[PDB]
Amino acid sequence: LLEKRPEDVVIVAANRSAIGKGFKGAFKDVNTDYLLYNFLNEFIGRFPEPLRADLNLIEEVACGNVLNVGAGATEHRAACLASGIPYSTPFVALNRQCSSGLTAVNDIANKIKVGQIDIGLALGVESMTNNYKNKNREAKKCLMGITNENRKDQDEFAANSYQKAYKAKNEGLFEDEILPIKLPDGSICQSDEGPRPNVTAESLSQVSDGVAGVLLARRSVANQLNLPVLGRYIDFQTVGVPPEIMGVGPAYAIPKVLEATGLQVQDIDIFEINEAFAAQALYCIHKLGIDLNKVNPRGGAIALGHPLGCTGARQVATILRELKKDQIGVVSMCIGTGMGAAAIFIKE
Amino acid sequence: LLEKRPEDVVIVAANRSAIGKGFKGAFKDVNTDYLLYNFLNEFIGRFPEPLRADLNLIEEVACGNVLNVGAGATEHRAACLASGIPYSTPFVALNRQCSSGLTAVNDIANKIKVGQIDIGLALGVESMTNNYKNQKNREAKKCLIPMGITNENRKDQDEFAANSYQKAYKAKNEGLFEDEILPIKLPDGSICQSDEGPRPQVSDGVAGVLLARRSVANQLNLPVLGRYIDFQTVGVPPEIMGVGPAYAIPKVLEATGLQVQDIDIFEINEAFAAQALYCIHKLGIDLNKVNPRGGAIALGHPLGCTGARQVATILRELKKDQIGVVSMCIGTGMGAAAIFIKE
């Protein structure tokens, strides 16, 4: 599995923006279209010379999105079009709820794999700020908090993430993966404005906005073009989970991707398990038996925020900077109307 | 290619609904969730014993949609939930615009090829009637050119148009569109199951396609209407979005080795007569092969349903071992095309 074959799906670049605060945040006066346009312009400069030389080398743009009309396909495609990605490049809008951005990844993973394409861009956007704006059993469930309701450990959990996120923030740890998004006033945003110092434990995830991109390619095509390689996508698995207890997703998706690859929990160095809510994150980690030490190393959703769409691909950018050469890490998250997703990766 | 390996992505079922008329037709007092719930209750019935038994063997439901909030991901999951498809079955909402129903098929194909799943359901749904109610740079503004205008970018069109209605009613009347169309029951008691438009187009309709690996089909004793060969997409100038089929057909043929003259039926979506004519001409296609039972000019084009519809239609127009393609130009400047084989 650690053997690099020429038919591997390889990650060439994985970047994300600073996650702003919903409603209050840096992004409030901006929508997914400006966020996307801008992140793209940044992401492209960060691209190896043969690519930016011929952008029509990207043969597909899957963009995950949960709240726009039709998942933002017209605006997101216009945005790509403004950031130099040629018309010659098809675009696909996807919405698998909370995992959307991780599914943009599985979409391109498979196309490349199957030969449909060689090089392909996975995206994730969400402007919860400007978009949150839009009964007979079973179907009566479907689309969060109450499925969670279905506290000491949870606050304990909320603070440690908040502490891990603050350390990491302050230690410069996210300075690699984050890109500066210029705001229309003149400002520029390169810090996650969600993690805060001194969070301890007190009685009383986050509505945010953000973009995140991933550039996959098949190893063969990479070597030929001599393109840097950060790690490689190994597999992906989704599962259906009772909608009333959505959060339970990770406790079923993880074992699934594990069995399908042959790995075991204890073969994983890092787990990027999305914390929609602390109650559910904790439950997932403890049912599986995951080492809490190995969970969300630099802070989670609780502290960082959760821009629905963008999250699944944000965790990828992130898990890559937390990993060390030849390490395996999973990316999982509970999904909205009752699902569970989880992709596996390796550094190199 | 006409060799059959168990590794094949095989169509086990593929039915559609009657395409209602926009703003006035049969479905006007209903939305996607109802069209879906119903289409599915029907489709599932027209499902082989084994699947109906389990229904959990279906491991993914990708479902195109173009105009709903978030392409109808929640509403339609519930519909599937309500029509007996288990929670266990994940779901994905896709929006490739005009080709959404086809790319939803592309989706299912790939997952099956890449071993991700065995059997999967592809869908298309749209209710232009209900949902049709949902930058300043020289490049992305082309993603603001109204479709019709891009068509601006007559006799021959009207002649091409005429045939569409002619072939469609001739065929509707001869009962050609019967095996494919399922009966969508309506609130006011009136069952609907006949195409309004063809009576010698904005519309609402649903469509479903149940792929499975060949090896798997033979294992569960399942019927096999045909096979998915390839699919290909290619961007195109948004100002002439229509020219999309002219490029995606060569590309998918090329990807397969096939040639134009190797194709029997050419189900090229008629989004406009001006457009479809061009692809036809540029490609050098025998009209007797293009849209045999008429097109969308008569039948209507329920945006995200179409792709999944054309597959239903084509699979009847094709005889055992015939190859045919399904192309359509795509909204913001694209073009798709797939290739199927009967058996």
The reported resolution of this PDB entry, expressed in Å, is 2.8
Domain of A229, in residue numbers: 1-133+173-233
Method: X-ray
CB B97 within 8 A of CB B331: yes
Is A66 an 8 Å CB contact of chain B? yes
How far is it, in rounded angstroms, from Cα A285 to Cα A240? Answer: 19
CB atoms within 10 A of CB B258: 18
**Partners of residue A77 in chain B, C-beta under 8 Å:** 143, 332-333
User: Do A46 and A195 share a domain, yes or no?
Assistant: yes
User: Do B310 and B186 share a domain, yes or no?
Assistant: no
User: Do B217 and B281 share a domain, yes or no?
Assistant: no
Q: Which of B106, B213, B114, B216 is nearest to A260 (CA)?
A: B114
Name the residue facing B140 among A81, A107, A238 (closest C-beta): A81
Kindly write down the DSSP assignment for every residue of B73-107, as one continuous string. Answer: HHHHHHHHHHTT--TTS--EEEE-GGGHHHHHHHH
Of the candidates A198, A233, A268, which is a domain's last residue?
A233
Q: Which of B63, B76, B301, B305 is catalytic?
A: B301
**SS3 state at A67:** coil
Is A140 an 8 Å CB contact of chain B? yes
Kindly write down the DSSP assignment for every residue of A179-205, as one continuous string. Answer: E-EE-TTS-EE-S-SS--TT-------
CB atoms within 10 A of CB B159: 11
Which helix (H) or strand (E) is A44 found in, with range?
Answer: helix A32-45
Of the candidates A233, A251, A281, which is a domain's last residue?
A233
How far is it, in rounded angstroms, from Cα B61 to Cα B59? Answer: 7
- CATH of residue A312's domain is 3.40.47.10
User: Do A96 and A163 share a domain, yes or no?
Assistant: no
B93 and A88 in contact by Cβ < 8 A?
no
Q: At what angle do helices B273-283 and B155-173 cross, to 10 degrees?
A: 90
What is the DSSP code (8-state) at residue B29? T
Q: At what angle do helices A32-45 and A73-82 cross, to 10 degrees?
A: 40
Q: Which amino acid is at B33?
A: D
User: Do B12 and B113 share a domain, yes or no?
Assistant: yes
Q: Which of A76, A189, A306, A310 is catalytic?
A: A306
Close Cβ partners of A110 (under 8 Å, ≥ 6 residues apart): A116, B110, B111, B113, B114, B116
Q: Which of B323, B187, B166, B332 is nearest to B260 (CA)?
A: B323
How far is it, in rounded angstroms, from Cα B67 to Cα A134? Answer: 13
**Partners of residue A93 in chain B, C-beta under 8 Å:** 71, 94-96
Close Cβ partners of B138 (under 8 Å, ≥ 6 residues apart): none
A114 and B116 in contact by Cβ < 8 A?
no
User: Do B158 and B246 share a domain, yes or no?
Assistant: yes
Instruction: Give the Å distances, CA to CA, from A101 to A296, A308, B230.
Output: 18, 8, 26
CB B197 within 8 A of CB B24: no
Chain B window 110-129: which residues touch A at a Cβ cutoff of 8 Å? 110-111, 113-114, 116
**SS3 state at A13:** strand
Chain A window 260-279: which residues touch B at a Cβ cutoff of 8 Å? none
User: Do B76 and B208 share a domain, yes or no?
Assistant: yes
The neighbouring-strand residues paired with A294 are none
Q: Has B301 been annotated as catalytic? A: yes
CB B11 within 8 A of CB B121: no
CB atoms within 10 A of CB B260: 15
Sign of CA dihedral A58, A60, A62, A68: positive
Number of folded domains in chain A? 2
**Partners of residue B79 in chain A, C-beta under 8 Å:** 139
Is B204 an 8 Å CB contact of chain A? no
What is the DSSP code (8-state) at residue A186? S
CA angle B39, B45, B50 (to 5 degrees): 130
CB B233 within 8 A of CB A91: no
User: Do B211 and B142 share a domain, yes or no?
Assistant: no
How far is it, in rounded angstroms, from Cα A45 to Cα A83? Answer: 11
User: Do A91 and A45 share a domain, yes or no?
Assistant: yes
CB B108 within 8 A of CB B60: yes
Q: Which of A209, A210, A216 is nearest to A179 (CA)?
A: A210
